[PDB]
Every structure is written in C-alpha cells, then in structure tokens.
Design an enzyme around this catalytic site. Sequence first.
Site, short mmCIF file in Angstrom:
data_model
loop_
_atom_site.label_atom_id
_atom_site.label_comp_id
_atom_site.label_asym_id
_atom_site.label_seq_id
_atom_site.Cartn_x
_atom_site.Cartn_y
_atom_site.Cartn_z
N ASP A 10 8.69 -25.79 15.67
CA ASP A 10 7.69 -25.39 16.65
C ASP A 10 7.11 -24.04 16.25
O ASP A 10 7.81 -23.18 15.71
CB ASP A 10 8.31 -25.29 18.04
CG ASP A 10 7.25 -25.26 19.13
OD1 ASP A 10 6.36 -26.15 19.11
OD2 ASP A 10 7.31 -24.34 19.97
N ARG A 29 6.47 -16.77 -2.43
CA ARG A 29 5.31 -16.29 -1.70
C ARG A 29 4.32 -17.42 -1.53
O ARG A 29 4.00 -18.14 -2.48
CB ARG A 29 4.68 -15.12 -2.45
CG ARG A 29 3.43 -14.57 -1.83
CD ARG A 29 3.09 -13.24 -2.48
NE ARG A 29 4.16 -12.26 -2.30
CZ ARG A 29 4.34 -11.20 -3.07
NH1 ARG A 29 3.50 -10.96 -4.08
NH2 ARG A 29 5.35 -10.37 -2.84
N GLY A 30 3.83 -17.58 -0.30
CA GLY A 30 2.85 -18.61 -0.04
C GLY A 30 1.52 -18.25 -0.66
O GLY A 30 1.18 -17.08 -0.85
N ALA A 79 8.95 -12.03 4.10
CA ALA A 79 10.10 -12.91 4.24
C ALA A 79 10.60 -13.33 2.86
O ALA A 79 9.81 -13.58 1.96
CB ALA A 79 9.72 -14.13 5.07
N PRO A 80 11.92 -13.39 2.66
CA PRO A 80 12.43 -13.78 1.34
C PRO A 80 11.98 -15.18 0.97
O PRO A 80 11.84 -16.05 1.83
CB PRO A 80 13.95 -13.70 1.51
CG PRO A 80 14.18 -13.83 3.01
CD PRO A 80 12.99 -13.18 3.65
#
Lengths: 565, 555
Positions: free
Chosen positions: A371, A319-320, A315-316
């Site tokens: 959620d 980065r986690g 995902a753009p």
Amino acid sequence: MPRGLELLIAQTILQGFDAQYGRFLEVTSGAQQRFEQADWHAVQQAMKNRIHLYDHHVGLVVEQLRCITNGQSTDAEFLLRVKEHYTRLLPDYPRFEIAESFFNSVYCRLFDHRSLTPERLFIFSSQPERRFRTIPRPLAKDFHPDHGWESLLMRVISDLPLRLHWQNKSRDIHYIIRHLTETLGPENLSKSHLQVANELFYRNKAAWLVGKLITPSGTLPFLLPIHQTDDGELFIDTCLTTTAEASIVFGFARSYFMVYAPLPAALVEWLREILPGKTTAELYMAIGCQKHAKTESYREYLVYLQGCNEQFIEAPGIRGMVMLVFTLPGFDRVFKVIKDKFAPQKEMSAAHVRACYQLVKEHDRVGRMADTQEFENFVLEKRHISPALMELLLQEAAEKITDLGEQIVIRHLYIERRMVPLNIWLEQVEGQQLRDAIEEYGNAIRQLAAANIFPGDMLFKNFGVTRHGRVVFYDYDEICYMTEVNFRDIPPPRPWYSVSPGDVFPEEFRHWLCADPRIGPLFEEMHADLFRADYWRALQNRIREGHVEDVYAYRRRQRFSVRYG
Amino acid sequence: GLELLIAQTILQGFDAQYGRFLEVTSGAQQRFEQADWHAVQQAMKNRIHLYDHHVGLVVEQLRCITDAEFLLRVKEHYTRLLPDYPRFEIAESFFNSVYCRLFDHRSLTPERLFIFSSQPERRFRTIPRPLAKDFHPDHGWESLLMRVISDLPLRLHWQNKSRDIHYIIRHLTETLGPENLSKSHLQVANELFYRNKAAWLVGKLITPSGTLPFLLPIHQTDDGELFIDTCLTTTAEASIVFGFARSYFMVYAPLPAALVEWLREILPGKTTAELYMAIGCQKHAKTESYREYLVYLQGCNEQFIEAPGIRGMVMLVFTLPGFDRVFKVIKDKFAPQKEMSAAHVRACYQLVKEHDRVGRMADTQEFENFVLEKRHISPALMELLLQEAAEKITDLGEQIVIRHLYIERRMVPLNIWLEQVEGQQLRDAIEEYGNAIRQLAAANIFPGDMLFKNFGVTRHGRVVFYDYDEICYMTEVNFRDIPPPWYSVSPGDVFPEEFRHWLCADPRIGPLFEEMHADLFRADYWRALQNRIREGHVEDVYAYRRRQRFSVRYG
Ligand SMILES: Nc1ncnc2c1ncn2[C@@H]1O[C@H](COP(=O)(O)OP(=O)(O)O)[C@@H](O)[C@H]1O
Ligand SMILES: Nc1ncnc2c1ncn2[C@@H]1O[C@H](COP(=O)(O)OP(=O)(O)O)[C@@H](O)[C@H]1O
Ligand SMILES: Nc1ncnc2c1ncn2[C@@H]1O[C@H](COP(=O)(O)O)[C@@H](O)[C@H]1O
Ligand SMILES: Nc1ncnc2c1ncn2[C@@H]1O[C@H](COP(=O)(O)O)[C@@H](O)[C@H]1O
Ligand SMILES: [Mn+2]
Ligand SMILES: [Mn+2]
Ligand SMILES: [Mn+2]
Ligand SMILES: [Mn+2]
C-alpha cells in the site's frame, strides 16, 4: 451574523463527514451479498467504489463551502474560527478522530495542502485519550465450552448470517478441534474459550471470522477463513492461532477488509490484542479507514522524527531510474518521489507513473503489492536532510522542491512500508531461508500474474522482504494488465526480427533470474513454469474467461484439505 | 547471378508480405462475430506493422547474400518479373522500400527505383474474379434487400431483419421517389469492410440519373444480434466514412488495385493514395502520394511557404499554396516553456498512427531525407528552415535534404475557420469542436492543448485534431477541481474549469460552447469518461450524423 457563517461552515463540514461515513458503511454492508452470490467482480468494484468515497465527499463539502462563503473560504482567520467551533462540536461525536481527519482534508483542499500548522487543523488530535468507556453496542460475543468444543463451534458457525449451505459442517468443526488440541493440549483447551467479533471481515472470495482464543497462558488470535466451493457451498479452509499468521492476514500488502464498523476506533482497539505489532495507522488501514490512517501515519512520523537523532538518507539498494527513495535509518517507511527526468532510454511520463500507483492502490493487491500513501507538499527541515540526500534531491527532483528558508517542500511523494530489497536479502541468507525466499519470489510473480498484474521489470531489486519473510513487489511503473501483454515463445537474437510493444518472451527471463548458481537451481526447481509462454498464456486465458484466482493468506501446508486430507 | 537472385528474393518477400496481409484481414469477420473488440484493435496494430517487418527480413536476407550498374540490373530483372504479376504496383512499392533501407533513403532517382511505375496502367482489363455482385429488384426491393442480407456470410441472428429492410426502403423511397426507385438497382461489393465494432456493406446504387454510394453499417446488440444502423447514399457521407481521419478498413482484397478502381465511382473526390490508404494499403499509399506530390509540384508555379495560422512552437509547418497536404518538421529547439524531447514528439505521432483515430485525428506519413529544390522554396520559408530546423537540413547545392518530416492532409485551422463562418455554419463548427473533444476523450485520448489553433476543419466541415505532442491517455490524467482564491500542480493534473478562460474568451463563441458543451468544463464529466474507459467500455462512434440513425430518424 459573521459568527453564523463560521458555525454554518463548521456544521457543513461535520455534515459531510456524517454522510461520508454513512455511505462507507452502506457499501461495506453489501459485502455479504456480494460474497453470498459469488459476484467476485462486484467485490472488486466495491473496493474501488468505497476507496473513492472520502475524496468525493471532501470535494462536495469544498464546493459547498465555495458557494456558501463567496470568497471567505480562503480567509485564514475565518477558518481558524471555524476550526474553534468544529473543535467544540467533537466531545459528544462518536467518530471524532475521523471527523478531525475529514476537516483536515477540507482544509487541505482549500489551501492546496499548504500552510499546515497545528493551530489551523488537527495535525494532532484535539481530544484526550479518554475513550475507553464501555462500548454502547458489544462488538464481540463470548463463547465458553460448557458442553465441549464440538457444539461450541457448532453454535458459532450456526450464528453466522451467511445464507448458503455448508459442504460438510462438522468435518470442518473437527478440523478446528484437531488444530486447537494439537496446539493447546486437551487439558488447557478445555479451560480456554473464545471471544469472536460479531462482524465478518470480507476480502475477495473469503469471509473471515475473527476472534480471540483466550487460554490459561494468555490470549491468541483465532482466525477462520470461510470460502466457497465452485458449487456454492461453505467451508472453513483453516484455523490460525499465531500472531505471525494474523499479522500477515491483516498485512500491509493485502486489500483492506470490508467489515461493518459503526465505531472503528473500538474495533481498532479490540484488534490490538491479536495484532500487537501493528501501529494504529496500520489497524485503521486494515479495516478500510485509509484516509484516517494517513492522518495517523503523519502523527506516527512526527513522533518518530522528533525522538530520532538521525538524518534522512537515500534508501539502501539499487538506485531507481524513475523514483528517488529516501528514509530515516530506524524508520519503518520509505519516501518515494518521482524524478524530474528518467533515464534517456525510458520514454514515459511522470503522469504514467502516478497512474500506475493509483492502479495498484485500487487493485486487489493479493498480498504482493505494498500500500502507498500519496502526500502533496510534504515539508522537511533542511537540518534533517543528509548533505548526500540533499544534493541528490536538488539534482534529480529540483522541479518538485521549493525552498522555505530552513525548510523545503516536496510537491509530491509516496510513503510506503519499508522492506529489505530482495537483491540485498538474497546476499544475506543461506540454505533454508534462501529456499523460502526464492519460493516466495516466484509465488509473488505467479499470484500477481493470476490477478492480471504483469510486473514488467521482475528483477529482484524491485521486490521487498517483510519482517515475516514475505516477498512483495514495489516497482510499479512497468506494471501492465496481463491482458495487455503478448506472450511469445522464440526470444529475439541478442534488429531485423520483429518485436512490438507489449511483447514478452518468458524464455528470456532465465538469463537474468538464473545467472547465479546459488539461485538458478532453486528457481528452476520450483518455478520453471515461469519460463514457458504457455504457462503465462494459461493465466491470461483464465483471466479473459472471467475467472478470479483463489489466494490463501497463509502457507498452503496449513489448509485443512492439505494437512488433514 | 546474384542480380536475379536478389530480384527474386525481393519479389518473394512481397508475395509473403501481401499473403500475410490478407490472412490478418481474413480474420476480421470472426473477430467481429465474437465481438472481441481488443482483438480488432490489435489486428489493426499488427497489420499496420506487417509491411515493415517483411521489408526488414528481406533486407537482412539481401545483406547476408552480401555497384551502381549492378542495381540497375537488379531493378531491370525485377521489372521483367512484373508484366504478368497481378499486384505489380505494390510489388514496385516493396522494392522501393527495400532499396531505401539498404541505402538509408539516400540517392533516390527514377532510374534506381520505381519512383514512378514501370508498367502501363491496367484498369482496362476485365477483373479475373468479380469483386461485386449486381442485384436487380425483379420481385421488388423488399425481397431484394432480404437476398443481400440473407446472402451475407455473417454467422449471427438479426434483431429484426424485416424492420431494418423497411428502414432502408423508407430512405430509398424518400430519396429517389417511388418511380426512380423501380428502374434502379444495386451493385454491392462482395467483401464487407470491417472497422472497430462495425461490418460495412458497401455498394453502388445505380439510378436513372446516375450512380450513388450505398452504405449499410452493420452493428451488434449488447447481447449479440445484428442490425443495420442506417443507409447512406450521398457522396459526401461516403467520403466521410472513408475519411483520412478514420481507421483504415479491413477488407479482403486479393487485387487491391481493382477494388480501388471500383471505389472511385463512389468517393469521386479521393486521390488514389487516399483510396489505397482507406483499404489499408498504407505503405503503398505513401508511394502513390509522393507521385501525387511530384505531379502537383511540376505543374504548380508557386513556392513552398509556411502554413497559414498560429506558428507552432515545436513543429515547423509548410505547404504549397494550392496543395492538399502540409509538411511538419520537428524543430531543433522548442520554446523555453515546453519541456520535452524530439523523441517524445515522434512517440506521440506514433501513438496516433496506431490508435483508433476515431475520425478526429489526421493520418500522417513519415518521410526521411525528403529532398527539395532550393529554387522551389520561398525566401521566407528558407530563413525559417535554417533558423528553426538547422540540424535537420543538409545542403546539396541546388537542393536541400530534410532529415525527417511528417506529411499530413491539409485543413483550415479552426482558429481561422471560426473567423470565416457565421450563424448556422458557426454553430455547426462549435458542435463539431466539442464533439471532437468528447469523442477523443471517450477513446482514451486527452487532447492536451485543446485551443482552436490545434484543430483543423475538413472540406466537409468536420473538426480534426492535429497537435499531437501534448496528447496523453485519459487514464494518465488527474482531473481536479480548482481551489478557491496561485495553486500548483502534481504530475498529470488537469483543471477543466481553466478551459473556460481560453475557450470562452470571445463573445461570439463562448455562449455557443456553454449551450452545447458545458460538460467539458466539469471535472465530473471527464472523471466519468475516465471511469467508463477503465471499466472496459468502448464508446460507439458513428461516421455519420446521429440524426441519420434509423432508431432516431424513424423512432
Ligand atoms: N518499500 C521499499 N522498501 C525499501 N526500499 C525500497 C522500497 N521501495 C523502493 N525501495 C528502494 O528504492 C529503489 C527504487 O524503487 P523502485 O520503486 O524500484 O523505483 P524505480 O522504478 O525508479 O526503479 C529500489 O531499488 C530500492 O532500493
Ligand atoms: N493539417 C494541418 N492543416 C493546416 N495547417 C496545419 C495542419 N497542421 C498544422 N498546421 C499549422 O501548423 C501550426 C503548428 O501545428 P501543430 O501541429 O499545432 O504544431 P505545434 O505542436 O508546434 O503547435 C498550426 O498552428 C497550424 O498553423
Ligand atoms: N503535506 C501534508 N503534511 C501532513 N499531513 C498531511 C499532508 N497532506 C495531507 N495530510 C493529512 O492527511 C490526511 C488526509 O488528507 P487528504 O489526503 O488531503 O484527504 C489529513 O489528516 C491531512 O491533514
Ligand atoms: N525521402 C523519400 N522521397 C521519396 N520517396 C520516398 C522517400 N522515402 C520513402 N519513399 C517512398 O515511400 C515508399 C515507402 O518507403 P518506406 O517508408 O521506406 O517503406 C516507397 O515507395 C519509397 O520509395
Ligand atoms: Mn526498480
Ligand atoms: Mn521502475
Ligand atoms: Mn499547435
Ligand atoms: Mn504542440
């Protein structure tokens, strides 16, 4: 009989669902009394209780199957014959779509969410879209303005079952008339009428009347949120007639509604008109059918996946360092999997992360936390995965991946609504769009804090921006309760100065949040409170004194007390 | 000139440190009165950290003030400041800690710091302010106990003073008999000993035959009225209330050494370090405990050996045959099964150290660069040390240096105890084992690897957990039911039914477990405990047998 057992199991599963939905309705039925007696902590406990109901009954049914079959609950050909009998029980059953979900959940328990094939469970529905007959009980009542709108609305408010006094009933009625006139103009207004749902939609401190305002030009949402004075008197805080405002009220970042719905699929259908943007899954989740929404979302995922000609990509954004997050270019959801190893500084368990996701799930999300839907052993085709992403997955999440030839299985992930990370959004928008984004970012902090959620790592990269411009928190692993935090005034030098776990220095925040001259000034202007420990302590104290902060799922400008006070 | 400034900076630091220690302690009464139980918890965490903070500050002060003979003169000037100074024993500890920070716990010699005390012992002198009050039963014991209970400073109404007084009389009568009771009196400490949800009155019951403990734990109603839950008069029961596996007491002690001395008569079994640690002087207890170790070592004629029992796969554990403590050092590499960091292990020990140990987890004392004589170490242990802990050992000719270890009170591993004990003693052990689990679970501690080898049995028969590196909070755990006829696992998953394989494999033991702790194999039981924790409830814990509660043995 070998065939009696098959049928006994099929009836056992269906019996469990009978009971599960019955208990779901019983908890929901009690929403009025909880609201009427302003027992706001009962309201929050009821949301947790109702959330746990489905998994409980699935579990019970599974232990019943375990003790009944004495081994065969694991035989697959047996449970393929159970599924045939169960399928044949559904044509008469009113909540058949959810009955299939409940069977799916039983199946997945038996086989640790393995071996999910379209023949063994209801990955797709077994029944036709032949459900549009006239509803056995009307779910809404029409109201035409034969004697004008003042005493149209005075009957609607009259028919409410609420057993409390109104602060100023006709004041509120005139407010509503002013909004309707200013919106439609007197000629068209007198031609249009209401169709309002018979059940109120309860959430936290509000009781929502939900209707359709049918006009010459078309039909629109008609939402009146009913609140309570500190004393215990009722008033209507506003009137919303836009699809955009309605989409936010039924938004993915809010707690589910508590709305007594014996036929949820009918209520779901009725809501489509005023919620044209929502998928079927989103509508089911908005009225509290979370587990069935999971069923519907995997179907929505399959539909999209097969018609897209794109591969999964990371995902753009930033980065986690604990989560690995991927998506499909055109898909409205992200997939978030916990990494095998977190950054070497960070000493926390994957189980802590999972616990924080569950904390958020059963919390009042107050319009500020997305959620999530937890999936176990989610299966992907290797051919669908970008080589870049596949390399990432095997570096960072290898312990959670198993090879199945042309497919892989991810042991555990979360699916979350996709947003634009705010750190990207703020580089994209200017002037007013930028002002509104920083207003919302700071309001996100404040509202989470007043709801006893301390966001932890509050950097922009951990918030997302929705289609309607709203800012929503999604990095859950540094959440703690506000009551667990010790707010301090003097920031440490940046050794010999004592700082202990749980210490927070809100004055330090301004270094990160105001470093950019495009942004800082705006934050200073609107959210300087957020840099003062005394502000945070005030919220902390109100929380310890039991207070629950009001939350308005619409712009403050739109409150009657504001635009007409 | 600096040498004297340094000595005065250090002593000034201690003056402030102990003053701040008393002020945190001072607030225990108000915290109790307003039942602010999370304030009680954080005050214990805060107060545990106070000493190291003040040492840090003093060290930064000394550093900014920028020889070997030099520091023997700092020490000599410091020594000269002590002869009038009342809390000198801890002043020496505080100097020791400052020295060790400056010198990274290297080069510790009796000349360079107060390894042993510089002063003659002073238990001779008359306490400048009485710390306890005598109470004789001139008008009988009914209105003696109503004097002490009335005289309490607690500002709450009692559920039933006169009942609680009668309860206490029954116990004293049944214990001493009406005759001995009449020529008996109390000497009760003037400060209450606060811990968690209790305010303990601590006294001496002076009888014809001798002196006994006299403990009254004061509890609170859910609404907020005071009651005395029981009365304890045996040394064994007192030893448990002040046990190494319980949280320290918060007791206002301006002369801690005087309180330690007074406490000896009751609690005759505890070392001096243990008494200091029971009243919260944890860092000074470390000083006294290294002295106790040195004393024992010089008089022992045995070598260090690996500790008896199942060899740990993350920790290496040794002891001295007749010694009451073990040394636990983290291994260089863990068994290929265990996927974890040395930092995780250190973190779990730190979790336990500042947690309410709820009588079920041993206190640990962390040491850096602990020095041993090579000649004192068994060849077996020395081979183990160099195989498994090489990176943590440095050679210094006739001695080695262990970079990091924990010292823990020594117990009999439960896997050994259960092979030693039979019938009723065995029933009591399994009752305690399950209750250790239960009490830890209700305190939000999931023990992780709950096999018997990870628990110890104390001198008084109590079961205590000591394997900390698989601990996690109950709230972090996902308790699951086992799918029928393998299946694998998502983060945090625990299957309590799996416990039965391990815990009931032996026919002498399993049956007793089912009888007394079948709940522990049911996911529903743990989930229930999990929810009570999340719904904010804090479980009562009684430092005595449930039988002894007045509401039970007299109701
Ligand atoms: N709901 C979402 N929509 C879009 N992107 C997201 C979403 N959630 C996470 N991300 C992206 O994934 C990254 C990691 O997400 P986050 O939950 O913050 O994980 P971590 O705790 O590892 O930082 C973010 O920097 C962002 O790029
Ligand atoms: N307090 C103690 N008293 C006696 N023996 C102990 C104590 N603590 C540990 N041990 C012994 O050392 C071994 C390893 O201890 P433990 O803390 O369980 O290490 P690990 O985490 O490697 O299992 C135990 O099997 C036991 O023999
Ligand atoms: N790995 C999965 N892949 C596809 N659907 C799933 C998966 N896990 C659960 N579901 C579906 O999600 C719904 C609820 O499942 P559960 O969360 O197991 O109760 C059912 O429709 C299941 O079939
Ligand atoms: N390696 C060691 N050997 C002997 N005593 C020590 C050691 N480390 C600390 N101490 C003593 O433990 C007490 C507290 O030290 P510290 O933990 O450094 O505050 C002081 O009395 C120190 O002298
Ligand atoms: Mn993040
Ligand atoms: Mn994070
Ligand atoms: Mn062990
Ligand atoms: Mn271990």
